[PDB]
């Protein structure tokens, strides 16, 4: 393994159009039994499909290493974004090179048991 390794969580959501499962690797934080997941970049012309899927069906699966969790996903509240965003930037310093508005558009999703 190289200095370039970036831990990711595989988030599986239910496709909003077909109901088929869809997987996306995302950046994440653990907080007790919560897993916080976020897109790796922002300011997109479109929200990512995994985020639109979990808006329609909050029931998701998160895999970290070989551990599989069934969780229910919801947007971080304003307070939770303020709480988690600095820990995300610490864990993934590539976020530092984004401007303000870019950051405010990143989905930050709390998945809980």
Author numbering: 39 to 151
Question: Can you provide the manuscript's text about this entry?
Answer:
A deazaflavin-dependent nitroreductase (Ddn) from Mycobacterium tuberculosis catalyzes the reduction of nitroimidazoles such as PA-824, resulting in intracellular release of lethal reactive nitrogen species. The N-terminal 30 residues of Ddn are functionally important but are flexible or access multiple conformations, preventing structural characterization of the full-length, enzymatically active enzyme. The split barrel-like fold is characterized by a central six-stranded antiparallel β barrel in a Greek key topology with four α helices: A at the N terminus (the putative helix removed for Ddn structure determination), B after an extended loop between strands β3 and β4, and C and D between strands β5 and β6. The identification of these residues and the lack of classic catalytic residues in the active site suggest that Ddn functions primarily by precisely orienting PA-824 for efficient direct hydride transfer from F420 and potentially through additional transition-state stabilization.
Deletion of 26–50 residues from the N terminus showed high levels of soluble protein expression, and removal of 30, 33, or 40 residues produced nonaggregated monomeric protein. As expected (Manjunatha et al., 2006a; Taylor et al., 2010), the backbone trace shows high similarity to proteins in the split barrel-like family of flavin-binding proteins. The initial structure was then used to solve the structure of the longer NΔ30 construct by molecular replacement based on a 1.55 Å data set (Apo-1 in Table 1) and of a 1.85 Å resolution NΔ33 crystal (P3221 space group; Apo-2 in Table 1). All but the first five amino-terminal residues could be built into the electron density for both crystal forms (36–151 and 39–151, respectively). The asymmetric units (ASUs) for the Apo-1 and Apo-2 crystals both contain single molecules with similar structures (root-mean-square deviation [rmsd] is 0.96 Å). This alignment omits 14 of 113 shared Cα atoms because of conformational differences in the same regions that differ upon coenzyme binding. In Apo-1 and Apo-2, α helix D is highly disrupted, with repositioning of residues 129–144 relative to the holo-enzyme structures complementing movement of the post-β3 loop. In Apo-2, this helix stops at Y136 and instead a helix forms upstream from residues 139–143, and residues 136–143 display higher ADPs.
